[PDB]
Amino acid sequence: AQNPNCNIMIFHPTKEEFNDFDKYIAYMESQGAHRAGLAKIIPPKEWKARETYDNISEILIATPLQQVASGRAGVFTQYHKKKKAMTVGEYRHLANSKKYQTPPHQNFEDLERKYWKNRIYNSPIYGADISGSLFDENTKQWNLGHLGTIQDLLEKECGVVIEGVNTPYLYFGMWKTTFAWHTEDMDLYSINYLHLGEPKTWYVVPPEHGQRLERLARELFPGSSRGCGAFLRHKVALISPTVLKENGIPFNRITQEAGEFMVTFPYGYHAGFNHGFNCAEAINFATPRWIDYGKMASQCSCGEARVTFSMDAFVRILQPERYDLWKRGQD
Ligand SMILES: O=C(O)CNC(=O)C(=O)O
Ligand SMILES: [Mg+2]
Ligand code: NI
Numbered sequence: 001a002q003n004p005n006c007n008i009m010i011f012h013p014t015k016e017e018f019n020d021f022d023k024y025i026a027y028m029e030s031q032g033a034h035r036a037g038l039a040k041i042i043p044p045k046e047w048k049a050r051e052t053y054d055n056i057s058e059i060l061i062a063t064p065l066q067q068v069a070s071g072r073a074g075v076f077t078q079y080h081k082k083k084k085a086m087t088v089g090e091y092r093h094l095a096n097s098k099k100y101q102t103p104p105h106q107n108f109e110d111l112e113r114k115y116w117k118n119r120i121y122n123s124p125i126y127g128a129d130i131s132g133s134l135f136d137e138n139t140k141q142w143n144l145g146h147l148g149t150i151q152d153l154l155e156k157e158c159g160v161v162i163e164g165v166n167t168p169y170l171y172f173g174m175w176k177t178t179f180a181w182h183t184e185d186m187d188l189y190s191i192n193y194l195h196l197g198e199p200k201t202w203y204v205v206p207p208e209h210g211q212r213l214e215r216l217a218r219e220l221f222p223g224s225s226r227g228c229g230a231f232l233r234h235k236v237a238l239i240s241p242t243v244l245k246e247n248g249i250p251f252n253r254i255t256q257e258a259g260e261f262m263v264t265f266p267y268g269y270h271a272g273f274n275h276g277f278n279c280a281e282a283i284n285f286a287t288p289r290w291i292d293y294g295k296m297a298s299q300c301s302c303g304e305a306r307v308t309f310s311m312d313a314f315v316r317i318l319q320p321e322r323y324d325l326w327k328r329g330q331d
């Protein structure tokens with residue numbers, strides 16, 4: 001069995017190996033990358049996403065979200081408070097202000113200590129889930145706006161044509177902006193490209209151990225757990241590496257820098273934070289190996305998780321027994 005300790009693998013494809021996306025994901029899996037739940041892909045030196053980032057300041061962040069925490073330093077939830085619209089240029093200035101800027105630090109490890117110690121006492125502002133792309137239309141390799149769609153993958157594997165579309169999302173982050181413990185909708189893959197700015201630290205639980213994380217989460221968030229049998233779908237719970245180690249949950253950590261891709265694998269629980277002002281782009285995708293994970297994915301039916309139009313057909317076709325109850329939660 002390849003990668004039996006489920007370590008995060010890092011790949012350095014040549015320009016020739018960067019041509020065929022599907023083939024390269026399948027190569028990574030042949031080496032055991034999926035066992036970690038997360039992999040890093042460093043693009044060939046010849047490659048670029050676009051010529052410059054000099055003209056992005058007029059992008060609108062229509063609903064910036066202030067991430068307010070409750071709980072204790074290592075075990076907390078966050079809720080998103082909606083703020084007034086601002087441009088990327090306005091947001092970058094805010095990120096760099098004395099109230100919100102990255103503190104002085106020695107190295108990534110010192111910054112990670114400061115995050116875990118102090119996150120709860122601040123409420124950073126995140127520009128999340130903004131439909132759009134920063135890839136140049138002429139970038140032919142690993143362009144997240146030109147991937148094969150999940151609807152076409154289900155059609156190719158299963159023979160059923162379905163409605164729905166699949167487009168990327170932009171994330172503008174600042175110091176301490178946080179992504180809570182989750183897997184993707186329908187336990188899909190994701191791919192994330194860090195276009196510019198400061199790093200993003202990730203934590204991940206191997207897919208084979210995901211239920212261990214879920215059991216801990218039910219213990220640590222006992223009211224949430226009673227309200228919904230899949231409450232990590234709400235994307236609001238944080239658990240620190242210290243707490244995970246104290247409870248024996250297997251995980252790994254890695255920092256992504258500007259110009260690097262990360263791939264999350266089906267049922268790979270992940271969480272993390274941004275080091276300072278940055279812009280990432282991400283999208284879900286599928287392969288043939290995903291289908292069995294989609295069929296088994298948990299669902300939130302309490303009404304909190306509320307998701308895209310395109311998840312309907314996935315539930316309808318892969319999980320027909322669940323469909324009725326899940327749609328009640330959507331309406
Ligand atoms: O970058 C973020 O805030 C969160 N991204 C992801 O969870 C992802 O790409 O799967
Ligand atoms: Mg602009
Ligand atoms: Ni994710």
Ligand SMILES: [Zn+2]
Pocket residue numbers: 227228229230231233234300301302303304305
């Ligand atoms: Zn729920």
